[PDB]
């Protein structure tokens, strides 16, 4: 008879900079933190993660030629509608959306996954408004 968790938890606040770090090697760790696997009170059917704030999200890095070859597709459900964007445009025009997509693809599907995703805050530049929550710096262990 182990112990589950039910609403008697606390969520901390962490700030991670994305200067220099590669895309996946940071997104994986951030997703693991978000799901709450870093604490001994883990529970599959209850949200136990934390809040993750990312700063300097426009200085991300990719290895190889991916910066000109990785292509993001989307479909508009109309015939012949298939929109494409190169990674360079995604980086120089919507830097936060690329990070959001990369992290979101790494989270479980369903209601709990989509409710988990709501704890992620991504900011271009080196300034965030979350001051009253007293964020604590957290380096990437991996």
């Amino acid at each position: 008879t182990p112990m589950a968790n039910a609403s008697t938890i606390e969520r901390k606040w962490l700030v991670v900079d994305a200067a220099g770090k590669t895309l996946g090697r940071l997104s994986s760790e951030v997703a693991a933190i978000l799901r709450g696997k870093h604490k001994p009170t883990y529970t599959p059917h209850v949200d136990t993660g934390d809040h993750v704030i990312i700063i300097n999200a426009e200085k991300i890095e990719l290895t190889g030629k991916k910066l000109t070859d990785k292509i993001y597709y989307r479909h508009t459900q109309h015939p012949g509608g298939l929109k494409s964007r190169t990674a360079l445009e995604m980086r120089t025009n919507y830097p936060e959306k690329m990070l959001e997509l990369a992290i979101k693809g790494m989270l479980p599907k369903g209601s709990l996954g989509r409710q988990m995703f709501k704890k992620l805050n991504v900011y271009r530049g080196s300034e965030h408004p979350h001051e009253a929550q007293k964020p604590e710096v957290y380096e990437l262990r991996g």
């Binding site: 182990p2 112990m3 696997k37 870093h38 604490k39 001994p40 009170t41 883990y42 599959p44």
Partner: protein
């Protein structure tokens, strides 16, 4: 003689419908679909009664992994050290005590580290 055959079918059919109480819609009123569903739930329970045994070991392993990584060790290294630092037979369920009393778990990790190096 002639056996009319009444009062027997109703008694047997009514017991099937009593186990189907709580099902959605016509599955709890009509006899045929109720019998079909009660049979299907028969082996859904047998399958799950053995999955349950291998679905808590995973939870214990995950919690122990997190607790050990809070100390600098990993799960595999901690388990090897425990298996080698004597044995201290301890089911993952009873090594889940990291949640309740974290101090003792640190003592066990310290012993495993001491033997591991």
């Amino acid at each position: 003689p002639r056996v009319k055959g009444g009062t027997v079918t109703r008694k047997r059919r009514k017991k099937v419908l009593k186990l189907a109480k709580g099902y959605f819609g016509s599955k709890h009123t009509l006899y045929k679909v109720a019998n079909q569903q009660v049979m299907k739930s028969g082996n859904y329970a047998f399958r799950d009664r053995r999955q349950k045994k291998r679905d808590f070991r995973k939870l214990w392993i995950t919690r122990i992994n997190a607790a050990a990584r809070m100390n600098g060790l990993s799960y595999s290294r901690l388990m090897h050290g425990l298996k080698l630092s004597g044995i201290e037979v301890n089911r993952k369920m009873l090594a889940d005590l990291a949640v309740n009393d974290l101090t003792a778990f640190n003592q066990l990790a310290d012993a495993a580290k001491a033997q591991l190096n």
